[PDB]
Design a protein around this ligand. Structure first.
Ligand SMILES: Nc1ncnc2c1ncn2[C@@H]1O[C@H](COP(=O)(O)OP(=O)(O)OP(O)(O)=S)[C@@H](O)[C@H]1O
Ligand SMILES: Nc1ncnc2c1ncn2[C@@H]1O[C@H](COP(=O)(O)OP(=O)(O)OP(O)(O)=S)[C@@H](O)[C@H]1O
Lengths: 5, 717, 118, 60, 121, 60
């Protein structure tokens, strides 16, 4: 999974 | 007052401003200087890489003299560079040359004045030259250069300087080997960064600072015959001829689109009283084909203005920076006398680089290699010069940068529908390669392929050059059943020196130098000799293969393909027969059980280091009948490409599908003669039917079986 | 005893030190894998993406990439040929900002998070 | 690349062609490199594949 | 054939020692006797293409003009390090405004060394 | 150095290259140094290294 702000 | 027109002037060139400002090299300069001042012979020679700077170091010395960064024993002197044409061409008669030899050398020995000599190539003095045309290997300066009377500065390259050693072995102790080093890429960044003032004032176009680092580091891993300062400097001068052509006047893309107006519409006039056959079918096409062409016309001129509108914005707002700074540059920086525009207008000007320039950053990903109105230097425009110069064919992997690469999985899925997990690993490797990601010394795209004889083991492989590179020329078939001998190792790496075929370089080493970005087959590995496998364990491991030249070959961005049979001994009793249902409960676990047992065969034939070498081993399932529906149908799409001259359009109903399969297919032969079963019954009799006048030009053959075991001659308009 | 058969026993004489490498313990691989991300930074130092990996990410890698018998080549393959695949994909469209403190972690979910923080 | 020396036929790679043959500008493979770089770390990658006669050169 | 033989390098210590006044009086700098014996032993162990009475002389010839650069001019380090101060400050003067987000670290490389180089000075 | 005489066509380092080929200057490689110093001890490092063609020279 990607976790971007 | 010597004439010096016999050679050429050298000191006044820096007085003329032609050489003002040279990136120094302090370890190299003193090696020249400390050669010059000793009691004994005073003969430095620059020996080093051809790709390094030879002449430019001595040109740096003249700038060191005029500024006074020289010792007292070296002040005031003038270099003399030599025009080698004037030796032999000046010999109009025999008695008229050697007085100039007295005119030079009497100014060499007891002149005691401004004297520094330079030689472009000592090969033009000793390797070439008649005894009567000037200095040869048999002339003077041999017993003179013992003494420290005459001070010359030469420049030769290493492997050619080895001719002087083998010539007579007497100049070896008269001249001085000063080794010139390669300039160590991170210093060439500092060289080109010092050269930002000159090229930007040479032709005006702004040069980004990302691409300057990228002009050097990409030159390393790809270009071999040139070396570090030549690679770092020629590309920026080759950045001229891409930018100077396009940014001056109209660009080339608009000129390309203007060609299709007159070339294509010319053929409408060429068919007026031409009531002969099929060619009037183009009127169903050419009007619709012009609607395909002219929609591309309408978008480009609209986009050209928008990009030109960015030129109208950028070129004026950069002029506002001179107002905002120069007032502050003289003691207002120590006083910050406007607290008005130093925060407001400056940040908003930066916001225009954060808005108008990032759109030009966003302009790159659809204008990957060209540039319609772009004054920056993007890294892909630098690497396009590599595509323009190196062995790159036309439109390929890299020409569709970063956006078509995700779509490359789709086109490769249009070859072999079956075996996704193989192509999924094949999908990532191109994404590793052409997307500016990690290119290790591991060659990108190393894959082992296993399956029964018949399945699309090398199908995958042909399409990786037919569809990816669009060229069919990067394919290198290697019959590994031609390497069954123990002596056959030398066919790849070349032959050992002095022996038969040393003028050759090796069969597969040579083809990679002609095409450094290609796909590499190895066809029939199960028959190949066991010691040829000993070679490949360093080819997959490292890029380098030394040769007859000891030349370095890289295999970066080269997909190496490892098709081999190895499965008919294990696919033995038709284990995967009728795998049409594909078996979530059992079939899947058979593919686990089979593939580990094939790694056992990779432990058995191969001495299993190949498992450590190969990135990913793929195993092909045999063809299912659900696969055989669409896969056999693809040949009928390419059937109409060769037979549109014949203009028989064969239509295949679904009834025609299973008649071909159910009399011909087995999992042994992997649907190989099924396409021959197409060719062996119906395709032979088209040649006879074309002779007489029945199905010649416009006859729609409807091929069908009503469980009647015969092709039908039911025909339409 | 094999170096006197294959290598003609003078080689046992002429060579000063015959070093013999152990197979890799897992205690080394918490560092050896960690060294490769620093060498991976050197291939993304143009891109300025600083990839930081903790031991909570290393343990998932070793358990599903390491046999001792091959000496941790495929663990290396497991980084490049699997998890490095859509570091490349997410950069293609606008999903990887060129300055993000990229971090890898596992919530014991058998599922990976790559954490992007500016 | 010590995988190339599987031949006994390939020993003259290292020390060079004997005289009366092609290589004279090429004096040899490992010979000329050490003259160009006398401060070096000379690799030998895969000895188990090189032929026993190549090892006779390494004896000295 | 009156064959000249090489001069048997332990005897070439006496050859160099006879020539010391022709180097000491030539330009001014003394030459220690410890460097003579070491100048012979480099001719044996290391260089093999040139021959024996040259290499004992030609190193000391290079030992002559080496110290002339220092004493009759600027010394080594002061001459080198002041230019890197000038060259890197030239490279800042090539930049003078960039985009951010990449060159930020490059501003944080060249500028920070100037405090380091001048404290070395 | 006996290591350079492993191959059969390596005898030409003893008696030089045969005439009419590329070379023939420095007419022998052995038997030049022997002519330079005819009072000397001549070594042969091993003997098992050499091809049997080399040994026919040493019989003479
Ligand atoms: N230190 C340097 N600074 C700037 N430009 C350099 C430098 N060294 C080489 N060049 C460039 O190199 C090009 C000339 O090639 P050079 O290799 O310098 O010539 P060379 O050293 O004589 O090599 P040869 O002998 O001609 S094959 C010019 O474009 C120079 O600007
Ligand atoms: N998915 C597929 N797509 C297209 N063609 C296929 C496919 N599967 C099989 N084929 C056909 O099978 C051929 C594959 O070539 P090869 O791989 O050489 O076959 P092979 O009998 O396994 O021979 P090898 O692999 O060299 S031992 C092609 O010519 C295709 O026409």
């Amino acid at each position: 999974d990607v976790d971007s702000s | 007052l010597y004439i010096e027109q016999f050679g050429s002037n050298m000191n006044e060139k820096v007085r003329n401003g032609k050489l003002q400002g040279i990136y120094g090299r302090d370890e190299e300069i003193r090696a020249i200087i400390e050669s010059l001042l000793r009691y004994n012979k005073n003969s430095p020679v620059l020996v080093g890489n051809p790709g390094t700077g030879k002449t430019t170091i001595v040109e740096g010395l003249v700038y060191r003299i005029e500024k006074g960064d020289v010792p007292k024993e070296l002040q005031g002197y003038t270099v003399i560079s030599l025009n080698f044409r004037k030796f032999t061409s000046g010999t109009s008669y025999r008695g008229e040359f050697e007085t100039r030899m007295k005119n030079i050398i009497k100014e060499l020995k007891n002149k005691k004045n401004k004297i520094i000599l330079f030689v472009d190539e000592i090969h033009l003095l000793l390797g070439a030259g008649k005894a009567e045309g000037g200095t040869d290997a048999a002339n003077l300066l041999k017993p003179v250069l013992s003494k420290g009377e005459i001070k010359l500065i030469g420049a030769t390259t290493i492997a050619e300087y080895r001719k002087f050693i083998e010539s007579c072995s007497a100049f070896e102790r008269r001249f001085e080997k000063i080794l010139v080093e390669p300039p160590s890429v991170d210093m060439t960044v500092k060289i080109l960064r010092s050269l930002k003032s000159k090229y930007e004032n040479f032709y005006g176009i702004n040069i980004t600072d990302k691409a300057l680092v990228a002009a050097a580091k990409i030159s390393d891993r790809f270009i071999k015959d040139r070396y570090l300062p030549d690679k770092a400097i020629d590309l920026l001068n080759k950045a001229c001829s891409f930018l100077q052509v396009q940014l001056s006047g109209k660009p080339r893309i608009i000129d390309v689109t203007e060609r299709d107006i007159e070339r294509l519409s010319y053929e409408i006039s060429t068919l007026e009283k031409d009531v002969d056959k099929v060619s009037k079918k183009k009127y169903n096409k050419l009007i619709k084909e012009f609607e395909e062409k002219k929609e591309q016309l309408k978008k480009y001129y609209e986009e050209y203005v928008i990009t030109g509108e960015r030129l109208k914005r950028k070129k004026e707002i950069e002029k506002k920076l001179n107002d905002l700074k120069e007032l502050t540059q003289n003691y207002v920086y120590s006083n910050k006398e406007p607290p008005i525009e130093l925060q407001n207008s400056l940040k908003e000007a930066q916001q225009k680089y954060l808005e108008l320039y990032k759109e030009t950053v966003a302009y790159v990903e659809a204008k990957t290699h060209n540039a319609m109105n772009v004054d920056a230097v993007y890294q892909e425009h630098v690497s396009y010069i590599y595509l323009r110069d190196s062995g790159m064919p036309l439109g390929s992997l890299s020409f569709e940068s970063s956006k078509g690469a995700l779509k490359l999985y789709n086109s490769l899925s249009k070859s072999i529908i079956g075996n996704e997990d193989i192509i999924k690993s094949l999908s990532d490797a191109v994404v590793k390669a052409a997307t500016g990601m990690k290119d290790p010394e591991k060659p990108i795209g190393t894959f082992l392929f296993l399956g029964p004889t018949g399945v699309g083991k090398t199908e995958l492989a042909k399409t990786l050059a037919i569809e990816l590179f669009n060229s069919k020329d990067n394919l290198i078939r290697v019959n590994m059943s031609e390497f069954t001998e123990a002596h056959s190792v030398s066919k790849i790496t070349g032959s050992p020196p002095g022996y038969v075929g040393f003028s050759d370089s090796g069969q597969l080493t040579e083809a990679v130098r002609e095409k450094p970005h290609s796909v590499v087959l190895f066809d029939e590995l199960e028959k190949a000799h066991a010691d040829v496998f000993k070679v490949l364990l360093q080819i997959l491991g490292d890029g380098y293969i030394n040769d007859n030249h000891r030349r370095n070959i890289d295999f970066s961005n080269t997909i190496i393909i490892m098709t081999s049979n190895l499965g008919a001994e294990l696919f033995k009793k038709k284990l995967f027969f009728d795998a049409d249902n594909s078996g979530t409960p059992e079939y899947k676990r058979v593919m686990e059980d089979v593939r580990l047992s094939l790694i056992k065969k990779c432990k058995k034939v191969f001495k299993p280091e190949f498992v450590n070498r190969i990135d990913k081993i793929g195993v092909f399932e045999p063809l299912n009948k659900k696969n055989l529906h669409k896969i056999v149908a693809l040949r009928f799409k390419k059937l109409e490409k060769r037979l549109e001259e014949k203009n028989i359009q064969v239509s295949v109903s679904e009834k025609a599908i299973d008649y071909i399969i159910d009399q011909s297919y087995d999992p042994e032969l992997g649907a190989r003669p099924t396409l021959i079963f197409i060719e062996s019954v119906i395709m032979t009799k088209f040649a006879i039917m074309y002779l007489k006048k029945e199905l010649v030009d416009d006859m729609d053959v409807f091929v069908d079986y009503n469980s009647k075991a015969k092709n039908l001659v039911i025909n339409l308009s």
